[PDB]
Symmetry: D2
Subunit: 117 residues, 4 copies
């Protein structure tokens, strides 16, 4: 149910394949911030979830370097896939930029993204 | 390689074994001493393979889904942070732990915290 | 629509937030949750920017509830941090942290995080 | 209210946190930051659990600063959420959210997250 092409409330394009082992692999493209064109992603998901109506746990990471640009930063998304006639992936995320140790207290942004097919 | 590649330990007694590839990949295993977890779990992630040379740390992140051959907690953690080199190198992080829940219980699905890793001991 | 932070507000979880914004920056009022280890109303206090920018920016604010009243005590506290938007509708967008008291061995799992959006028109 | 949470507290970033805990559950006082767009003292208010568990658990609490005083305005607010742990090495252990006001287009980057630990013993340094 997870494999396919997804979009969020910020105009992003999330392309991902879920392997039978628990792997997540694919590409991320952001419409905002210090970013252009596509970026590599990798993560993990629960391949035998509970059967009681609970969602399926997952996560993935992007490091914001590619052939066109390097922002010296990385985002991780943590959340759950909820199946159904209108499938969704609901997340919260942490964006850390590299800093001097004197600026380390302001290194990390927090937010939330919702994805649909 | 040297630097991030190695065996790391946090303040909760975890053992984090990782390899950093020249292509920006992180690969390895994670063992937790706390929570609904037993033995080792697979991890994967990414890092900046060309950091700034102005004294800044190196940005990185990784994910564990808590299922292996011993048990399954129906959950996953992501760690987001930076690597700082030198005589007392560290990896400094914040994390999000999401558990699978019904819709009505989604407001209490996610724990947040902070872990510091060192290569000593 | 009715402008101003002072008023009666509802979130996407069934909660009610009743607040007054004072001229010096203070927030005072009550909070009622429809989920968790809670019943009836609880005291809150907080702060807001009483002279915000006017370049399209929202108004920054925050408040705290400790989950003890005359009916129940959950031994926990939540803080909400966010901004009053000030666009075409009355809306406040927030992120929150809920910490429960724990022993030291359980402190790693002490804190939940999430996001609530509040509107004067019940959603 | 005269001891415990009440007192002068210091964190790992050089801040000074001066607070009084009332019998009624209230927190009142001043906060001074040594980093960021901030100068001199700011007003704070918050709440704590005035009847905590007796099994050895910490005391739950939270407070807010809006970063406006007579000297400057950063158009932002921070909330700290955490617990008080008493003893010879008493601490207040916290996680925090700092929201800046932004346009609707930039709302995705409005909020910083971190963690502060406070002690009643003033750090040594430096002159
Ligand atoms: O600015 C950077 O350092 C890199 C681009 C960051 C984009 C962020 S990741 C979280 C959020 N969701 C998106 O689709 N874009 C932003
Ligand atoms: O209980 C679970 O659902 C799985 C085990 C969670 C262990 C967490 S991950 C964050 C923190 N750091 C650790 O080393 N262990 C805990
Ligand atoms: O169970 C508790 O410890 C006390 C009640 C907590 C309810 C939380 S506060 C964050 C979220 N928003 C709501 O309106 N309710 C929940
Ligand atoms: O830059 C601003 O907008 C206001 C100053 C923010 C300072 C922060 S609050 C969290 C952290 N702890 C401190 O003692 N200082 C910083």
């Amino acid at each position: 149910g997870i494999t396919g092409t997804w979009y969020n409330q910020l105009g992003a394009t999330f392309i991902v394949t879920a392997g039978a082992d628990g792997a997540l692999t694919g590409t991320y493209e952001s419409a905002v911030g210090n970013a252009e064109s596509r970026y590599v992603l990798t993560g993990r998901y629960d391949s035998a979830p509970a059967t009681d109506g609970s969602g399926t746990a997952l996560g993935w990471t992007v490091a914001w370097k590619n052939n066109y640009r390097n922002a010296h930063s990385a985002t991780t998304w943590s959340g759950q896939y909820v199946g159904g006639a209108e499938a969704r992936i609901n997340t919260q995320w942490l964006l850390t930029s590299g800093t001097t140790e004197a600026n380390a207290w302001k290194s990390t942004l927090v937010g939330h993204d919702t994805f649909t097919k």
